[PDB]
Design an enzyme around this catalytic site. Sequence first.
Site, PDB file in Angstrom:
ATOM      1  CG  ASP A 171      29.691  27.385  15.534  1.00 45.56           C
ATOM      2  OD1 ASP A 171      28.984  27.048  14.666  1.00 45.56           O
ATOM      3  OD2 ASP A 171      30.358  26.034  15.679  1.00 45.56           O
ATOM      4  CE  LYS A 210      22.738  26.880  13.553  1.00 46.26           C
ATOM      5  NZ  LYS A 210      24.083  26.670  13.533  1.00 46.26           N
ATOM      6  CD  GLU A 228      26.481  24.957  11.051  1.00 47.27           C
ATOM      7  OE1 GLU A 228      26.019  24.469  11.301  1.00 47.27           O
ATOM      8  OE2 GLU A 228      25.647  26.033  11.419  1.00 47.27           O
ATOM      9  CG  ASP A 274      28.241  18.675  12.919  1.00 44.57           C
ATOM     10  OD1 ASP A 274      28.561  18.948  14.553  1.00 44.57           O
ATOM     11  OD2 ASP A 274      28.188  20.007  11.961  1.00 44.57           O
TER      12      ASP A 274
END
Lengths: 112, 382
Positions: free
Chosen positions: B11, B72, B176, B200
């Site tokens: 991840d 990211k 994800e 999330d």
Amino acid sequence: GSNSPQEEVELKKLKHLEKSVEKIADQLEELNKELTGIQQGFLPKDLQAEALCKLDRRVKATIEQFMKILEEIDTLILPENFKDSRLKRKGLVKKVQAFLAECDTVEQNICQ
Amino acid sequence: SMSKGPAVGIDLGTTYSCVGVFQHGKVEIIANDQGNRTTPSYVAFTDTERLIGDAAKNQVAMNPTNTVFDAKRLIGRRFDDAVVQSDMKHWPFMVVNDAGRPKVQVEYKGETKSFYPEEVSSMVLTKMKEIAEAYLGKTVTNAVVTVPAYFNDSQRQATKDAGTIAGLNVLRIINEPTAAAIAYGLDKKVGAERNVLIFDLGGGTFDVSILTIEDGIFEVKSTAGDTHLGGEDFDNRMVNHFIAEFKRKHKKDISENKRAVRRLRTACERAKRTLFSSTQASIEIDSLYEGIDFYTSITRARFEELNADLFRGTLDPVEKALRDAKLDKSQIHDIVLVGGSTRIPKIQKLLQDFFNGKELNKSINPDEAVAYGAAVQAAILS
């Protein structure tokens, strides 16, 4: 005179932190001696600025190590009855803060 | 030399990354060299070396301009992307335009160097690969890497390129929310089509995704969220509360003393975590400011009050994702909690109440669920 076995645990944690502080303080001591050495030494005035600014990385690393010690001491919870632990905690934080003030003096004297 | 090891799941997170391995019939989330089950997605450049993960995060205060994170947020994007321009304002490191593409610019061994976001992420992936090899005592090459469901072609390709640069054989790139659904075996439940909501809230981002799983096929129906929401916002409310308390109690403002604010912020972060399972948290900071000792406490109820608008606001992207997916809340079969902030009981309560008492999928550590699902996928593809 009601010393508990529980407080011995906290006192041992504080002794380990005191030892950790002593190691960082030795690093500060070398920085202080090197700074004094440069300020009072025979380096040509032209090369002194470079020698002083070379201490920057080390002094910042020393400051950070002391800040991490304060954050670890800040995790302790000591009841009012643990008088010896509270006094040791107070003394240690004050010692770390005085060392941080010495670090700040080094920073005021380098890379100016 | 070491023998060949299994395939891993990684991840690659905005602030932290996590690597898992499926073996002996279960997923093992791998601790790094410092014993941490998540690793900061940080890379630092110094006078003498390059540091990754905990070693990079640990010296951020010492070397802020040359410590890169949040790659990211830049990966696969154009320099002129609104997201890049907005984000750049808040980072201490420089972001430059190289023929339309962003690059992070740093000082490294006394020289100016620039890196593409995929090069930075490749360094984080190399560390995750090294963490898996140190634990397994075997070489690791094969991995399943995760990306957000909203990543476009360029963002997905740049992530695959980060994997290749790191020397990983990227078995597959999966979303994800899909990795989180896989971790809970939601595709294995017997019956008709299942509507899954992935909530999330971790690592500085908030993402809500709705997926439909039909005959093992995952389809992303909608995505919603807040790009900059997380634990730090909740910590900041606590900090403001304490700074105000110190002003009321001592008529002194500690806000301009960076070290005092840091000690307080660190203690708030820890108290917030204590509040996950305890109803009260105590804080004792000797000589916080002008020699004054700060001994205080905060209840879970006060923590909830200070953050009430932020917590209740997490339901707005839930409602938006439901409307975009053309589904009633009663049509959601499974709710999955991902990210460290979902450990907050009030957040769980607000979400469970919204879904009329429906049980939440939360037994897997929220910080590790995505790596967990990726590790399951990696084992399937082996």
